[PDB]
């Protein structure tokens, strides 16, 4: 019923990996002019990708995977892992009366309403769940270790890594929310909404290159642009 000592070590390992990956408390509060906006967005995205790789690397069993499968998982999960980690900050690191200022600031910039509206709908939707930092870290590792990604040769090897993380998360959902027995189903339900961002991001990327905005070599490599 409760988390076994092995599950607690596994959770604590993941949490240590998740905390060692943190963006500045200077860049968060400060979050500007028109052309400087397109430069901050390119730094934000690079920072997400740098943090995502560092985190993934440390996931139990990831280093035992085929080198091509590792690249496919990284490339396939980057957008979804980025939207999930931003939701963690938006709901838990940053207060209610602060997220709204960030929404207005991002809208008044270049970026499309077709991109912003679903982005904040997801943040409000996932925010209602009152998720702990352990729930965000496990859901991020689950999103990354998706066996259904394009170019995955050994799918069962990825499924073997993902299954124990889903087990810990299912237990954490009862222990922290026994009043709402559907909390876990709601968390997995939020992943369907999270998968739509792959299409939205790809649209936003084609507009980025024609509006003559710069891409860093890392962003070009992870998204093929």
């Amino acid at each position: 019923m409760e988390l076994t000592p092995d599950q607690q070590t596994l959770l604590h390992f993941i949490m240590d990996s998740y905390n060692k990956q943190r963006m500045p408390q200077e860049i968060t509060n400060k979050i500007f002019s028109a052309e400087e906006n397109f430069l901050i967005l390119t730094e934000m995205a690079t920072n997400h990708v740098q943090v995502l790789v560092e985190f993934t690397k440390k996931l139990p069993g990831f280093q035992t995977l085929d080198h091509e499968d590792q690249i496919a998982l990284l490339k396939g999960s980057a957008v979804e892992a980025m939207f999930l980690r931003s939701a963690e900050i938006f709901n838990k690191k940053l207060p209610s009366g602060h997220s709204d200022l960030l929404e207005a600031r991002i809208r008044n910039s270049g970026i499309s309403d077709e991109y912003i509206t679903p982005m904040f709908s997801f943040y409000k939707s996932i925010g209602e769940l009152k998720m702990t930092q352990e729930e965000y870290a496990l859901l991020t590792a689950i999103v990354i270790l998706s066996p259904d990604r394009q170019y995955i040769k050994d799918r069962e090897a990825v499924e073997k890594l993902q299954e124990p993380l889903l087990d810990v998360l299912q237990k954490l959902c009862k222990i922290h929310q026994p009043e709402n027995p559907q909390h876990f189903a709601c968390l997995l339900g939020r992943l369907t909404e999270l998968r739509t961002f792959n299409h939205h991001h790809a649209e936003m990327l084609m507009s980025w290159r024609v509006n003559d905005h710069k891409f860093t070599p890392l962003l070009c490599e992870i998204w093929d642009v």
């Binding site: 790789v53 560092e54 690397k57 690249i71 890392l218 490599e221």
Partner: peptide, 11 residues
Amino acid sequence: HQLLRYLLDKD
């Protein structure tokens, strides 16, 4: 994919 492998393989 030069940068991505570097980030994956580095110590």
